[PDB]
């Protein structure tokens, strides 16, 4: 009883079931703001029942608490009005069933909804790593004024724009809004409204609603972009820029501070993540929250208006695929003849078959991409001009909305070599794409790897939970106790290069890390960066301009604090974009940050020089 998960210390002491708590399935409800969420009417009445009883007593509607209990059972209109008052400013913690990272529990302002299902704002759904495949969230209600203030100050979703693990927006738009923006922020060689001159983005929106000009036609429209070059002052610049109507419309969503260059691109997923990061860096968090919410609304609306749809005719099977497969089969027969002739051994023959099949798979993929990504040829006020294809599936893949190029290659191109469960590659690959009927043997070979992956993912989750628990337990006793140790010692930070490429640029590694000593310029005796300065984006860029290859930087191992870590040594919080605040528990943050990706992690000469130097 004393020990183990069954044991009480793990069973209850570590994790205690709580009152004022409830579970329900998740629902999208995009209409909600990011800070707020959807809460069922009936669930709220049960969750906030003591608050309701107190408010009824203060109102005097209930003379006694026993009467208040009866009124809650009656569910009269007065009780529902009382619930609205309590729900107005009591934040509710929303917790995903596997809380791998701190983002798993985020407080929200509850909004009464008729449905019996909790609604989670769509942008934060990616942060929760949750889906809507009947996922269930535990909902807890903080009670005390300290608890409510803690929730609003830190727990609320608006506060945690950036993931603790990496200084990147964890509210990055995931599936539909990114697709809608990519359809919006796209160029066509010829479409109605092309070549027009527009007074402003408002006129672009009005033309689009009138239907005179499509979203993705290019026009010459002035853009009034405000520049934050003056620190804290906005300098308006108006210029005529050759952009699509859709990008002009989206420009209204963007606040004044951000430049127009960011919207002028295709705006896929990495692009929109960079846009959000730039917005957070340049403007305040509140403008960033408003910008993200407006992005989600506009993306959903224009995705719905777009009418993106996947169809069989949308899938394109390269005409060269059958010829390539026949050539590969002829090559395989030639290798088999060589094996029969005895020229090539069984192992060498198997290797050659694998190599030729891989080459054929690559050729099929390349042909499919050539006939998918730029296939559309559109008349352009004259000769027909090839343009990037608007195929919906290619739009999904290129925008990064959902599914990489590998999934599309499995879909329309031949699936390729599928290794049998032990690890050895099957000699005969799956030459049939998902669009065409797969042979029974092909399906069996595929299901080998599918079941292997499913079982390996189950044990991934198990081992990831174990590793996360171990990391939390070893690193629980780590809190920021001293603002500055003053330890001159520190680890040397340099970009890591394996020779093929720079795997990690120095900019990302030393970002938000306080220098161990004065950073001199490569020019001798020129101190570019002082001895103890936090490296924000400006400092990291400044180091890049002067090309400081090696920077010695403070580390948590370097600090001499006992039972604590130097605040300067830890560096940026990485979630709020400033030096770590005193008292924050970095240890649990880091343990959760390391443990969480474990699910994604898979369980199972001549010196060539790239460029002159």
């Amino acid at each position: 009883m004393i020990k183990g998960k069954q044991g009480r210390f793990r069973q209850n002491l570590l994790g205690k079931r709580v009152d004022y708590s409830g579970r329900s399935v998740i629902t999208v409800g995009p209409y909600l703001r990011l800070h707020q969420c959807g809460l069922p009417k009936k669930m709220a009445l049960e969750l906030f029942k003591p608050f309701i009883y107190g408010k009824l007593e203060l109102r005097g509607l209930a003379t006694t608490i026993k009467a208040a209990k009866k009124m809650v059972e009656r569910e009269e209109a007065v009780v529902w009005d009382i619930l609205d008052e309590v729900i107005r400013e009591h934040p509710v913690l929303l917790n995903r069933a596997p809380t791998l990272h701190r983002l798993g529990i985020q407080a929200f302002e509850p909004v009464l909804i008729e449905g019996k299902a909790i609604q989670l704002h769509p942008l934060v759904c990616a942060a929760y790593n949750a889906d809507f495949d009947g996922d269930q969230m535990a909902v807890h209600v903080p009670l005390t004024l300290e608890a409510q203030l803690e929730a609003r100050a830190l727990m609320m979703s608006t506060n945690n724009i950036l993931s603790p693990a990496n200084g990147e927006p964890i509210i990055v738009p995931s599936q539909d809004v990114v697709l809608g923006l990519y359809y919006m922020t796209r160029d066509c060689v010829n479409a109605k409204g092309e070549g027009m001159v527009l007074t402003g983005p408002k006129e672009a929106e009005r033309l689009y609603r009138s239907g005179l000009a499509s979203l993705h036609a290019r026009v010459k429209v002035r853009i009034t972009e405000y520049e934050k070059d003056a620190n804290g002052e906005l300098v308006a610049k108006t210029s005529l820029k050759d952009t699509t109507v859709g990008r002009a419309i989206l420009w209204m969503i963007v606040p004044k501070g951000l430049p127009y260059s960011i919207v002028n691109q295709a705006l896929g997923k990495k692009a929109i993540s960079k846009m959000l990061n730039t917005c957070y860096r340049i403007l305040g968090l509140k403008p960033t929250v408003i910008f993200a919410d407006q992005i989600m609304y506009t993306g959903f609306a224009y995705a719905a208006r777009s009418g993106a749809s996947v169809g069989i005719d949308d899938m394109v099977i390269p005409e060269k695929k059958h010829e390539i497969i026949s050539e590969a089969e002829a090559e395989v027969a030639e290798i088999q003849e060589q094996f029969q002739s005895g020229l090539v051994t069984a192992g060498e023959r198997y290797n050659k078959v694998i190599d030729i099949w891989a080459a054929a798979n690559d050729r099929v993929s390349k042909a499919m991409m050539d006939n998918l990504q730029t296939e559309t040829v559109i008349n352009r006020d004259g000769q027909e001009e090839k343009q990037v294809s608007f195929n919906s599936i290619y739009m999904m893949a290129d925008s990064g909305a959902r599914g990489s190029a590998a999934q599309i290659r499995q879909l329309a191109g031949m699936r390729g070599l599928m290794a049998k469960p032990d690890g050895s590659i099957i000699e005969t690959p799956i030459t049939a794409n998902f669009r065409e009927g797969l042979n029974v043997l092909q399906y069996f070979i595929s299901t080998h790897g599918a079941r292997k992956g499913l079982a390996d993912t189950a044990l991934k989750t198990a081992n990831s939970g174990y590793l996360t628990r171990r990391l939390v337990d070893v690193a629980q006793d780590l809190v920021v106790t001293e603002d500055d140790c003053g330890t001159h010692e520190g680890i040397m930070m340099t970009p890591v290069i394996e020779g093929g490429d720079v795997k990690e640029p120095l900019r990302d590694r030393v970002l938000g890390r306080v220098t161990a000593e004065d950073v001199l310029k490569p020019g001798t005796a020129d101190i570019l960066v002082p001895r103890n300065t936090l490296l924000h984006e400006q400092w990291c860029d400044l180091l890049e301009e002067n090309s400081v290859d090696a920077v010695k930087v403070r580390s948590v191992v370097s600090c001499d604090t006992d039972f604590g870590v130097c605040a300067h040594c830890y560096g940026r919080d990485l979630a709020r974009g400033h030096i770590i605040n005193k008292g924050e528990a970095i240890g649990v943050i880091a343990a959760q940050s390391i443990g969480e990706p474990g699910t994604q992690l898979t369980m199972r000469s001549s010196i060539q020089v790239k460029n002159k130097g």
Binding site: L14, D19, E73, K116, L143, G403, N439, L454
Partner: protein
């Protein structure tokens, strides 16, 4: 020619591959196994009689008496299956065993027995499998899933890699008995063979050999060949064989007769070996050095005194050679070791072995098996004999014998269950050969090595356990019992044998609660195979390899249908065409190919027999003469897919669907979708809840007929005939005279089960699908069951699907649904919840069921009757009182909150000797009247059939039919009839009818008396009232809905119909789906499914438009014929000219909703066929239809995909999963939330959640949740007062769980205290 249901509605089939074998009875595996378990077996093999023969010789020890089993008779059930379900008792048959007890002469066993005692005794009560295939064990249907366990026999494992941390492979041999102790031989890193029994500490392998009374010389002779060494003047030249020279370099000159074939220290080439044979010289010269490096194999005793010069297995030292030379041992026999071929593994173990005789070996065995026990000679002998040579303790099944013999290459199929000396030595020899590299290790994942133990075998084993228990009891009693004094019934106690079987059936790892959630779920669970259970792998013990699918699973176990979760691959579903072999191994039907022609005859192939042969692909083109169209056909030979010549292949897949199970087969276009999504979709189909209306799948596999008919949800026509009378409650068929048996026959009455509480709280509703006068053929489905439409399995609703992202409502996998769906009650499902209130014999008086409860609302009492039981059909809401149980001087059962609906039925149950209350008497009277009405009805229908037969031949015999009509038509016997061929039958019918009137009156009395007698109840309960609550759960936001292809999603919003998108024709799309799930989760079949559904609905719409107006029958007939032909070598090729105009009209009316399509799993429709079918309708062939927004009215760009995809609502409704509590009951550990939805419990804020708030700056919230919300006798009470006072102040206190920890550790003996 088609069946009437097929004539009523015939599914268009796009399958281009003809089938040679029909789908086998899906539940044959359970039914046949249990039947063999209970079938009277004259030869005593694989049945209860086999167990009786094995366990009942009963020769009393020193008692000179014997009790012998004779025959066993299954008793008639006390209650029927439905009666057993209602009353809650098990559906079991008492076992009547004829036992004969004979007493021999006084101390003369050879003397004949003096007298016999032959009589029948009740010996336990065995649950009977229903005709459906289930077991009713506590009033609830239970299905015993078949177990996949390691087949008994000898298996060899490499255990390579991690062992020895050196790359050396440590082969071990495991002999697993069906019953007994495991025998394991394992190799040490030092190449020492070690024996291990029952997974105990390892022992030298020689020890067991000594236990076989093998001397060391015998051991060397068995495990080693002996080279002969001859004493010669020429350095002791020895006879030798050239073949043994091959494979090693020579350390000496090979010279015979003065001719040196190979010189000193020369590598022996192949030419040298060959010339060594060509010389055929027997003696080969050997120097003193080479003979020295040898180990002797036999003891050599000096001639002078008889003392041994060399001991067995001792290295030949030079002085030993001199000692034997002076002794005169001319012939020397020493073991031959070739490190390449023959290693000295046995010899090294013998050197390590310290037990030099059988006595010491048995002493060591006794010490190891029973540590701390002083060894004894007879005790050790008995222990070893019981361990490996006793029939009762150790048993190898016939399957075990066959597997053991085949693995050891034994010619005889079966030997003896007990292990023999030759078997063990052969196992060791095989292990040695595997160590040498000869042969290969057995594969555990190989499905030939894994036999399926079905219900019959498991029941036989548990019955054997009960039999050995009762045998111990009866042998202890008989030995000291008085002779010829106690009857065998007195000697035999049925309690242990009954308890063993009851425990196995009611509660076991393999005994599972049957999920009646869906007829497909019912079929899958019955066929489902789980490796879990007794004698099987657990969740944690199983590694990746067992879960991973071995290519031998093809055609036996469905790769696609494996439950997701911790148990992935541990639980598997039987492939549709597979059926278990006689020995329990899986077999796949395969078509024999003589030279090139695929002969229609099918031979079932075992997994081991599959390997040697080569099997053709299912998608193998045929010329219609049986020859393969392709010269080279893709085939699988030894688990490898490679092309082969048409003549080479000798077997072919019987059908394309044999790879998948029943659940996976139902998925249409399964070939196109990814395996993972197919697995998920197959799992979702089981959880589909029967909708209010059963709608045929507009697109389907075509196996829905097989699943529906084989499942017991729908009644079938036992005998074909005309529907005399049909009702929602019951259907009467009058069988045709050819079907009718000559006597007491002519009608078949099927009492359809109305709304009944399912095992998963759904509704089992039997809806008639036929009316009066409809000709019903034999095997036809009279009434559709739940989720059944005209004999086709209808899990859900074919619903309009639009694949577009709509305002983000369908964000990740969410699903929009139009208010039209809710308005039409498309997915509304009836849920039956059974609430039981139990009156108990409490202290200070018993609880009172009568409505004497005070301090209750008058409205609540109004719903209750005078006795307190709620009136049938009274709508109630959560928190309303249903019964009148009173605490002895508020205990009355109330509706659980959030539960509502009419009370369909109240089954009051009264203990025997407890007077029924007013309402209970009325409920019993209603049951008595209903039983009387049903028995009178059965008598009346039996009379109607009897009257018709009697009247038919009454005219014969020269008596006016009208005169017999004036007499009672049945009782025409008073009027004499001249004898005729049927007159004797008619006289028998009338005499039987008169006797039947008395017999049926007695049957009516017995049935009524069974209701009248108080039902047996759990002790200490006066009465239990079973109130059934029925609620119409509808589509609610958050409800989990999934398609067959695995696109699971919750209902995001109940969108108004006008907001939903509409096409140009104005028809609003009912469901809008996110198209982004298609690319990543590569279930591209759902897009193909949607397109084909659109084509089918286009056909249905044209048919409906023809039907709406008045169209000539010829026009509609030719259009439907065009629909059913569609070219492309379709297998059906149905001709409508055969069908009559009425049949065509009925078919069209059935097709008015839509034209069903039978798309098989892997020979399904290609995209071109779907394009042609779309072209048949007015729909665009592209499959993309221009769509307009419902809200704005503006056309969407890029025309969307619209079509009907089958949609399933899953039982994980938001109603069940929604939960919350502010304050509620707490546990003993004072954790205020009890946990779970059933109790009013709060969600567990576990370690992950604690660390999550811990990483945040959350301290006050964490402290509050830990202390004041979980465990504080003062804080929880205080906080409540503070909140109702309006101030949110938290008193920290100290958690009660921490005090529990403190007191527990202090109890353990550790002084733990909180010092200041």
């Amino acid at each position: 020619v088609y069946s009437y249901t097929e004539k009523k509605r015939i599914r268009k089939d796009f399958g281009k591959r003809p089938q040679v074998l029909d789908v086998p009875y899906l539940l044959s595996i359970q039914l046949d196994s249990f039947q063999k378990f209970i079938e009277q077996d004259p030869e005593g093999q694989y049945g209860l009689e086999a167990a009786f023969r094995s366990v009942f010789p009963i020769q009393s020890y020193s008692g000179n008496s014997e009790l012998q089993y004779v025959s066993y008779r299954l008793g008639e059930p006390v209650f029927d299956v439905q009666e057993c379900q209602i009353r809650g008792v098990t559906y079991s048959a008492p076992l009547r065993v004829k036992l004969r007890l004979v007493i021999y002469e006084r101390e003369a066993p050879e003397g004949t027995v003096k007298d016999i005692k032959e009589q029948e005794v009740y010996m336990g009560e065995i649950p009977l499998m229903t005709d459906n295939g289930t077991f009713v064990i506590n009033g609830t249907e239970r299905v015993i899933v078949s177990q996949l366990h390691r087949s008994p026999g000898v298996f060899f494992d490499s255990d390579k890699g991690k062992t020895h941390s050196s790359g050396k492979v440590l082969y071990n041999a495991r002999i697993i008995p069906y019953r007994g102790s495991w025998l394991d031989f394992e190799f040490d890193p030092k190449d020492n063979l070690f024996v291990r029994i029952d997974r105990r500490r390892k022992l030298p392998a020689t020890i067991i050999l000594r236990a076989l009374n093998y001397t060391t010389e015998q051991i060397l002779d068995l495990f080693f060949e002996k080279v002969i060494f001859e004493i010669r003047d020429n350095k002791l030249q020895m006879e030798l064989v050239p073949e043994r020279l091959r494979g090693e370099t020579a350390s000496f000159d090979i010279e015979a007769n003065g001719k040196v074939y190979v010189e000193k220290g020369r590598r022996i080439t192949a030419r040298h070996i060959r010339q060594l044979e060509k010389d055929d010289v027997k003696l080969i010269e050997v120097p003193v050095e080479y003979i020295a490096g040898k180990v002797v194999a036999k003891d050599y005793i000096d001639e002078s005194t008889g003392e041994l010069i060399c001991a067995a297995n001792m290295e030949l030292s030079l002085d030993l050679l001199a000692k034997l030379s002076q002794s005169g041992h001319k012939r020397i026999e020493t073991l031959f070791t070739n490190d390449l071929d023959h290693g000295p593994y046995i010899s090294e173990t013998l050197r390590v072995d310290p037990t030099n005789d059988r006595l010491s070996a048995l002493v060591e065995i006794y010490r190891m098996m029973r540590p701390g026990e002083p060894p004894t000679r007879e005790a050790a002998e008995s222990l070893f004999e019981n361990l490996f040579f006793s029939e009762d303790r150790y048993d190898l099944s016939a399957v075990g014998r066959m597997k053991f013999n085949r693995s050891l290459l034994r010619e005889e199929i079966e030997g003896s269950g007990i292990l023999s000396k030759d078997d063990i030595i052969d196992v060791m020899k095989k292990l040695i050969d595997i160590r040498n590299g000869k042969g290969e290790v057995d594969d555990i994942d190989h499905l030939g090595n894994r036999r399926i133990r079905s219900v019959g075998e498991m029941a036989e084993n548990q019955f054997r356990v009960g039999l050995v228990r009762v045998e111990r009891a009866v042998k202890e009693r008989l030995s000291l019992g008085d002779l010829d004094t106690l009857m065998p019934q007195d000697m035999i106690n049925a309690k242990p044998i009954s308890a063993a079987v009851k425990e196995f059936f009611g509660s076991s790892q393999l005994s599972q609660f049957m999920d009646q959630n869906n007829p497909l779920s019912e079929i899958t669970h019955k066929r489902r195979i789980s490796a879990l259970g007794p004698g099987g792998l657990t969740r944690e013990r199983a590694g990746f390899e067992v879960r991973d699918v071995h290519p031998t699973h093809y055609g036996r176990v469905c790769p696609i249908e494996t439950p997701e979760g911790p148990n992935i691959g541990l639980i598997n579903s039987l492939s549709v065409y597979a059926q278990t072999n006689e020995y329990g191994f899986l077999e796949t039907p395969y078509r024999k190919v003589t030279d090139g022609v695929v002969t229609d005859e099918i031979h079932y192939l075992s997994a081991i027999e599959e390997g040697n042969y080569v099997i053709a692909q299912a998608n193998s083109n045929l010329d219609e003469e049986g020859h393969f169209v392709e010269d080279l056909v893709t085939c699988r030979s030894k688990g490898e897919s490679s092309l082969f010549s048409r003549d080479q292949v000798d077997y072919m897949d019987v059908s394309t669907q044999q790879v998948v199970s029943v659940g996976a087969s139902l998925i249409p276009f399964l070939e196109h979708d990814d395996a993972n999504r197919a697995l998920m979709g197959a799992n979702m189909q089981r959880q589909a809840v029967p909708t209010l209306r059963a709608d045929k799948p507009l697109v389907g596999t075509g196996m829905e007929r097989a699943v529906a008919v084989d499942s017991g949800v729908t009644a079938v026509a036992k005998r074909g005939g005309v529907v005399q009378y049909v009702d929602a409650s019951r259907i009467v068929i009058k069988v045709n005279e050819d079907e009718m048996y000559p006597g007491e026959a002519g009608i078949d009455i099927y009492n359809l089960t109305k709304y009944t509480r399912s095992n998963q709280n759904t509704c089992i509703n039997q809806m008639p699908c036929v009316s009066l006068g409809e000709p019903v053929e034999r095997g036809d489905v009279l009434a559709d069951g739940p989720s059944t439409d005209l004999g086709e399995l209808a899990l859900g609703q074919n619903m309009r699907v639009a694949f577009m992202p709509w305002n983000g409502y369908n964000f990740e996998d969410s699903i929009l649904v139009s208010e039209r769906v809710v308005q039409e009650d498309r997915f509304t499902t009836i849920h039956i919840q059974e609430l039981a209130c139990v009156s108990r014999d409490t202290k200070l008086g018993p609880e009172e069921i009568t409505a004497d409860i005070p301090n209750v609302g008058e409205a609540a009492l109004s719903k209750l009757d005078e006795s307190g039981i709620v009136y049938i059909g009274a709508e109630v809401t959560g928190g309303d009182i249903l019964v009148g149980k009173v605490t002895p001087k508020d205990s009355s059962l109330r509706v659980p909150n959030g539960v509502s609906g009419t009370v369909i039925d109240v089954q009051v149950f009264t203990r025997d000797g407890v007077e029924k209350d007013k309402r209970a008497l009325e409920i019993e009277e209603m049951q008595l009247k209903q039983a009387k009405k049903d028995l009178s009805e059965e008598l009346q229908i039996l009379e109607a059939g009897l009257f018709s037969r009697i009247r038919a031949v009454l005219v014969a015999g020269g008596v006016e039919a009208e005169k017999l009509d004036k007499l009672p038509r049945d009782r025409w016997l008073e009027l004499g009839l001249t004898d005729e061929e049927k007159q004797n039958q008619l006289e028998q019918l009338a005499e039987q009818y008169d006797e039947l009137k008395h017999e049926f009156e007695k049957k009516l009395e017995a049935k009524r008396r069974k209701i009248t007698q108080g039902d047996d109840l759990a002790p200490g309960v006066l009465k239990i009232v079973k109130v059934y609550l029925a609620v119409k759960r509808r589509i609610q936001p958050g409800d989990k809905m999934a398609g067959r292809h695995g696109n699971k999603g919750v209902i995001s919003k109940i969108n108004p119909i006008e907001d939903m998108p509409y096409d140009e024709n104005g028809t609003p799309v009912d469901i809008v789906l996110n198209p982004l799930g298609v690319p990543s989760r590569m279930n591209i079949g759902q897009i193909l499914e949607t397109h084909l559904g659109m084509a089918a609905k286009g056909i249905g719409d044209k048919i409906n438009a023809m039907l709406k107006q008045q169209q000539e029958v010829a026009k509609l007939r030719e259009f439907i014929q065009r629909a059913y032909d569609l070219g492309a070598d379709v297998r059906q090729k149905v001709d409508l000219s055969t069908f009559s105009d009425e049949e065509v009209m009925r078919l069209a009316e059935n097709l008015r909703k839509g034209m069903p399509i039978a798309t098989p799993v892997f020979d399904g429709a290609k995209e071109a066929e779907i394009k042609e079918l779309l072209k048949l309708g007015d729909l665009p062939t592209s499959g993309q239809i221009r769509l307009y927004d419902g809200r704005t009215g503006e056309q969407f760009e890029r025309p969307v995909t619209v079509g009907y995809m089958y949609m399933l609502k899953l039982n994980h409704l938001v109603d069940d999963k929604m939960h919350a509590r502010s304050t509620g009951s707490y546990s003993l550990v004072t954790q205020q939330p009890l946990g779970g939805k059933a109790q009013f419990g709060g969600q567990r804020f576990g370690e992950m959640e604690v660390w999550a708030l811990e990483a945040y700056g959350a301290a006050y919230t964490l402290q509050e949740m830990l202390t004041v919300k979980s465990d504080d006798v003062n804080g929880r009470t205080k906080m409540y007062k503070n909140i109702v006072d309006g101030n949110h102040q938290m008193e920290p206190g100290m958690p009660e769980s921490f005090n529990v920890l403190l007191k527990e550790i202090r109890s353990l003996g550790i002084n733990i205290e909180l010092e200041d």
